[PDB]
Design a protein around this ligand. Sequence first.
Ligand SMILES: [Cl-]
Ligand SMILES: [Cl-]
Ligand SMILES: [Cl-]
Ligand code: NA
Length: 129
Amino acid sequence: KVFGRCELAAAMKRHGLDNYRGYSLGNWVCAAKFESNFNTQATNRNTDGSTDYGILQINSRWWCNDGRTPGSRNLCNIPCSALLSSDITASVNCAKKIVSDGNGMNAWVAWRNRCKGTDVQAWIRGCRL
Ligand SMILES: [Cl-]
Ligand SMILES: [Cl-]
Ligand SMILES: [Cl-]
Ligand code: NA
């Protein structure tokens, strides 16, 4: 599923991400825009053999099991394919664990490079929330 900007903002808010660990909703929408272009089915392989999955590009070396990343830890206790669903629940639940692990949203490279320190509330402007 390819979400619209306001559609995703509303789903993210319903799932408890607004101000989660102090990160306003626009941070999460901006991160999803640049990680996946709002596409729940996005995958990208990394040089170390791990793969990033879904709307927030969650990595198989640490967070989910895809059966082909040796030494991975599956800290969200899910198969990575669950992160590609049109229902974002599994991605959101896993992201809550990632963002709580000490490094905040810096875990998402595109957030660090393209969202951090910008006017992120522009990503939710005009949306009925
Ligand atoms: Cl915001
Ligand atoms: Cl959803
Ligand atoms: Cl980047
Ligand atoms: Na893993």
